[PDB]
Design an enzyme around this catalytic site. Sequence first.
Site, PDB file in Angstrom:
ATOM      1  N   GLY A   1      20.623   0.337  -4.444  1.00 38.56           N
ATOM      2  CA  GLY A   1      19.353   0.907  -4.916  1.00 38.56           C
ATOM      3  C   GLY A   1      19.584   2.052  -5.902  1.00 38.56           C
ATOM      4  O   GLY A   1      19.054   3.166  -5.730  1.00 38.56           O
TER       5      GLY A   1
ATOM      6  N   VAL B   1      19.957  -0.035   0.909  1.00 37.39           N
ATOM      7  CA  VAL B   1      21.104  -0.933   0.723  1.00 37.39           C
ATOM      8  C   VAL B   1      22.280  -0.280   0.015  1.00 37.39           C
ATOM      9  O   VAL B   1      22.129   0.209  -1.102  1.00 37.39           O
ATOM     10  CB  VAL B   1      20.718  -2.223  -0.015  1.00 37.39           C
ATOM     11  CG1 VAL B   1      21.936  -3.087  -0.234  1.00 37.39           C
ATOM     12  CG2 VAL B   1      19.734  -3.013   0.808  1.00 37.39           C
TER      13      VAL B   1
ATOM     14  N   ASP C   1      12.227 -15.135  -4.022  1.00 36.34           N
ATOM     15  CA  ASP C   1      12.433 -14.030  -4.945  1.00 36.34           C
ATOM     16  C   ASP C   1      13.470 -14.326  -6.026  1.00 36.34           C
ATOM     17  O   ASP C   1      14.465 -13.616  -6.151  1.00 36.34           O
ATOM     18  CB  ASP C   1      12.775 -12.762  -4.170  1.00 36.34           C
ATOM     19  CG  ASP C   1      12.618 -11.501  -5.000  1.00 36.34           C
ATOM     20  OD1 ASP C   1      11.843 -11.502  -5.990  1.00 36.34           O
ATOM     21  OD2 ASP C   1      13.283 -10.503  -4.644  1.00 36.34           O
TER      22      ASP C   1
END
EC number: 2.7.11.1
Lengths: 275, 321, 5
Positions: free
Chosen positions: A15, A22, A128
Amino acid sequence: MADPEELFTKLERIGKGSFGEVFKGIDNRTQQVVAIKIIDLEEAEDEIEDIQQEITVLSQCDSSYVTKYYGSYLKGSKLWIIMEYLGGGSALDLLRAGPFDEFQIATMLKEILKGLDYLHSEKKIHRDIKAANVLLSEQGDVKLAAFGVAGQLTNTFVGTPFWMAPEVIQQSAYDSKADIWSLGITAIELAKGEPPNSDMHPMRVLFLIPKNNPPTLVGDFTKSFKEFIDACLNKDPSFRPTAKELLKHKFIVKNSKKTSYLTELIDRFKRWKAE
Amino acid sequence: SPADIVKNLKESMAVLEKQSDKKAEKATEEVSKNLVAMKEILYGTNEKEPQTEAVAQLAQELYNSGLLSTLVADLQLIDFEGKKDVAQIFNNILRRQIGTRTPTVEYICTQQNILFMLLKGYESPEIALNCGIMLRECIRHEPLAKIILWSEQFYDFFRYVEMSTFDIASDAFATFKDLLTRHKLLSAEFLEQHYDRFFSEYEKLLHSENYVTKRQSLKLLGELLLDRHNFTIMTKYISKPENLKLMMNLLRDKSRNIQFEAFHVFKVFVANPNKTQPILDILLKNQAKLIEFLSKFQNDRTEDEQFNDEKTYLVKQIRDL
Amino acid sequence: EWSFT
């Protein structure tokens, strides 16, 4: 009784912008580099059973075109999810240092498509798909990020409607073909650096996507590339090829190369970045 | 053919059992190709349909060979994607019936020890999860659920749901949950017939060091009580003063979620129209500090309406004695 | 703190 803070070493956050949840890490025992997700569970409070379902589903995958799940550790009320880490970086990160060949684009798509093939056969979907979730090993292997992986039968969301299929948007009954749609966008994205209508306001996008004509690949690209994309981006889901069918499309077949060649991209990026 | 395919698969099955290396890499690969064409017959190739004539002829040629028992007996020996197949094929048969009666149920009623081999699979981490998918498919049928809930091997869960692997611990609890819930009229019959021992071991759960275990058990207690079928158990529970001693403390817990979960068991003691003495002894002795607590307890939760209603109510109860 | 004893 297994303390993950001793077992693993947290390094920089993936991140680097994004989820403050994460991190890149090391398996102290093996010295193998892992991605580590930390989930609060107190703050989450919304069905631990959900988070666990999200895990059971992940753990069910052993394709080398989808990122591996390695296990989970509970410290107090925070849960450490350990996943396969990919040193090459993402297609989106790679794009930061210049554009891609139709060869490179087709090599990736071929791989992603295999991931998708594997996922679809197990009545799973991705949900995603985007340049940011097309990950690379330093050797040049390409695989889907674990983020998306989901069961078809089912903070439960996506942040941006750009890659979203028109039926999904309409809350409509939807399936694996909506993945195929996103692939279409991802393609345009790899070709162009950003998805159709990047400059637009996400609310406005959402209402255009189902109303307007599907987006298309524009400019100096071969007919078969464009045709690939027009295939994926059909408003009617049933008129969208399957993953398996797309694997043998003139654009893929004419243009895929060995994945090893993708390390040109990695190398280029490494050369490009400061620090 | 459906006839030969089971015979071709049973040989490669037996071969792998109690072995090598060169003839193990070749042999264990054979079982895989077998299990895929197996699963292919049960899920309709690409001719759209599973035929239902070829699927019928296949189904019988299975209890007769009895390979299912041993297939489970040596699941560890199969490969990942094959193990995945095994469950996928098994899950089809367990479901399939003419309409009137499920033959798979009646067949497993015969070959009994096949069920507990699965509950044993919770000790093999490489097989534990697979086994879960099978049993939770098995618990769906009443005559199979009868077998396990009333078994001696049933009280193994209480340390299966404590197993060091969080994934496996969780997956076990999922079965555990599904047993004591699925057939509420079957599940209810078990709990009053076994109150002492069952709740003896369950009481340990609520004292767990593991946050999830603690939470999920406390939550599961709640649902079990707030149940029409389990009325005779709840009344027998909401009267022992040890049970209320604990809940009260769980309300002091470091964790918001845990406390809130405890409150929902707590309220059931204090709502009792037939409270028994020891309960009142505890509630009266703590009367002063209790009204003091519920006033302050999770007031942040403003839009909770029903919760606040429950709260203002619990205070009238405690205040008026 | 609750009083039981």
